[PDB]
Amino acid sequence: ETITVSTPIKQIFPDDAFAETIKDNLKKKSVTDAVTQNELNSIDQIIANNSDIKSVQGIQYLPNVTKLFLNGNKLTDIKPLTNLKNLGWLFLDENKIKDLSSLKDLKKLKSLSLEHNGISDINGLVHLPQLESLYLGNNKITDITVLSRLTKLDTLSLEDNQISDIVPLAGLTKLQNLYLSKNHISDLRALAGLKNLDVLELFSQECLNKPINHQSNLVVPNTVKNTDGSLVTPEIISDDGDYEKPNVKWHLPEFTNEVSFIFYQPVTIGKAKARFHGRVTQPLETTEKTVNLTRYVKYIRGNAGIYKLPREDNSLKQGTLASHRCKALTVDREARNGGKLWYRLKNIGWTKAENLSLDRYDKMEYDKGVTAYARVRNASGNSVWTKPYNTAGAKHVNKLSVYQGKNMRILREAKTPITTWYQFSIGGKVIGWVDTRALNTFYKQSMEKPTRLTRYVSANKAGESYYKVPVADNPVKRGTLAKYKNQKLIVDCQATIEGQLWYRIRTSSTFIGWTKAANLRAQ
Ligand SMILES: [Tb+3]
Ligand SMILES: [Tb+3]
Ligand SMILES: [Tb+3]
Ligand SMILES: [Tb+3]
Ligand SMILES: [Tb+3]
Ligand SMILES: [Tb+3]
Ligand SMILES: [Tb+3]
């Protein structure tokens, strides 16, 4: 593309600073002056370094430019260069150019410089197979796969980038100048064949591993390889770490963020010396037996069987609880088999919780004091006490036998868990309580059945007396019949005791008492 009629510079080159540079180039006076295409065509070189140039629009009118130095500017676009075929030298350091799709048709390009352009994608360069010098230092490059095509390069610079994989260079045997410092390289095997190197730089590498769990024995494979394939021995290992065969080892007893080692190894490939150095960072029957109770087995059910283990099987019955009936005891090892709770008696076997109780039972459940008369019916085995056996204050009184034969007056009643008790007296004086089944109450009120018969007193029975109850014991004697000698007697009640007939007499006036019918007359 070109202009026909003369035209001013400013009219063609929008970017002032760039117009200015043209002016000087064409030796012109002022940016205003006009120029012809033929004057534009006479331009083959352009040196505009650090010229605060934001754009180069219009440079499409210099079809014969071959050298172009625009280092240290403010460019970001290069679409104008697109058709500048004869371009052979092109420097664009310190700029912000990222779209390279404009360089694909510059097949005569010999040397390219793009240092400090904040580049990361360079797949575009693949169209410049004839390049001889390439500068990409200080960018954000990680993948140099496409450089494998640039087999005419003798000079290549990629330092201060994020490169890790350099296999893409294994074939560039034509290389003489190679800069790879400040990258993430840790393997130089890929460089083993560059026999034509004169300049080689590999210092300050930063290699970051993938995090691993922290340990106290920590072991990390040394992954730094020489051109050879041999492991590079670590110069300086952090945290007092040591180095064995191919592993770097740490003792890290406590815990730390990361660990690391430093490598420094002079290498030579071709006729070039270099220092391969950098750092590698490594990110990192139920029994409740603890109790002691104080219980007293319920006197009753003293036929409670004791077992070895909390189970109800006679084959495991250690015996029978009954020999320990009235003592303060101590359990310990509790339990719960089949749902029911069991107990372990100190030194004694195992029984059920029901069987054992809280304290020395005494509850009589009632103390009445009815009316009756008994006689010891086999004392063999029983005694007489202060208030029913197994009861507060209940002391002792002679054996039951000590009262046999004699008539005992029933004064009271009782009924504790085992049996019913009868307080009693003899000769009027009270004695105590006794198991009612040991006695024979030959007389009970329930035996007093009513009637309505009439009688008088016997002249021969006048000496006989009458009582309060149909029992001829002195303590219940209430008088002598002879007091009624010839009065009318009304027999209202009656009772048959020990086979004899008694009547309860009374005058139409006053109540008399009980007397044997054998002493009266209806006559
Ligand atoms: Tb302008
Ligand atoms: Tb530089
Ligand atoms: Tb540099
Ligand atoms: Tb450098
Ligand atoms: Tb050489
Ligand atoms: Tb040490
Ligand atoms: Tb640390």
Ramachandran class of 207: left when φ > 0, alpha when ψ lies in -120 to 50, beta otherwise:
beta
Core vs surface per residue 174-185: b (16+ CB within 10 A) or e: ebbbbbbbbbbb
Quick one: which H or E segment has residue 12? helix 9-12
Ligand nearest to the CA of 55: 1
Ligand nearest to the CA of 242: 6
Report resolution in angstroms: 2.7
Q: Is there a contact between 248 and 222 (Cβ–Cβ < 8 Å)?
A: yes
Q: Is there a binding annotation on residue 20?
A: yes
Q: Is there a contact between 287 and 333 (Cβ–Cβ < 8 Å)?
A: yes
Distance (angstroms) between ligand 6 centre and the Cα of 247 equals 15
Ramachandran class of 193: left when φ > 0, alpha when ψ lies in -120 to 50, beta otherwise:
alpha
Residue among 333, 331, 336 nearest 296 (CA): 331
Question: Which method, experimentally, gave rise to this model?
Answer: X-ray
Q: Is there a binding annotation on residue 206?
A: no
Query: Please, is 138 exposed, middle or buried when counting C-beta atoms within 10 Å of its C-beta (0-12, 13-18, 19+)?
Result: buried
Within 13 Å of residue 203, how many CA atoms lie on the same side as its CB?
A: 5
Distance (angstroms) between ligand 3 centre and the Cα of 98 equals 18
Ligand nearest to the CA of 20: 1
Alpha carbons 131 and 514: distance in angstroms, whole number = 153
**Ion ligand 5, residues whose Cβ is below 5 A away:** 196, 198
Q: Is there a binding annotation on residue 33?
A: no
Strand partners, 426: 429
Distance (angstroms) between ligand 6 centre and the Cα of 240 equals 5
Q: Is there a contact between 294 and 220 (Cβ–Cβ < 8 Å)?
A: no
Distance (angstroms) between ligand 1 centre and the Cα of 438 equals 141
CA 505 to each of CA 18, 30, 455, 466, 510: distance values in angstroms, whole numbers, following the listed order: 159, 169, 8, 9, 9
Quick one: which H or E segment has residue 505? strand 500-506
Match 């219980």 to its residue by tokens.
Answer: 295
- Where are the alpha helices (H) located in 344-396, listed in sequence order? none
Q: Is there a contact between 343 and 334 (Cβ–Cβ < 8 Å)?
A: yes
Alpha carbons 268 and 80: distance in angstroms, whole number = 43
List CB contacts of 456: < 8 A, sequence separation 6 or more.
486, 487, 488, 489, 520, 521, 522, 523
Strand partners, 277: 264
- Could you give the dihedral angle defined by the CA atoms of residues 417, 419, 420 and 425, in that order, rounded to the nearest 10 degrees? -120
Alpha carbons 434 and 377: distance in angstroms, whole number = 11
Q: What domains appear along the chain, each with residue ranges and CATH number?
A: 1-205 (3.80.10.10), 206-284 (2.60.40.1220), 285-359 (2.30.30.170), 360-445 (2.30.30.170), 446-523 (2.30.30.170)
List CB contacts of 490: < 8 A, sequence separation 6 or more.
452, 454, 505, 506, 507, 508
List CB contacts of 396: < 8 A, sequence separation 6 or more.
383, 385, 386
Other beta carbons within 10 Å of 481: 22
- Where are the alpha helices (H) located in 29-72, listed in sequence order? 37-40
Alpha carbons 179 and 171: distance in angstroms, whole number = 16
Structure tokens at 194: 């560059």
Distance (angstroms) between ligand 5 centre and the Cα of 159 equals 21
Q: Is there a binding annotation on residue 246?
A: no
Per DSSP, 446 falls in state: G
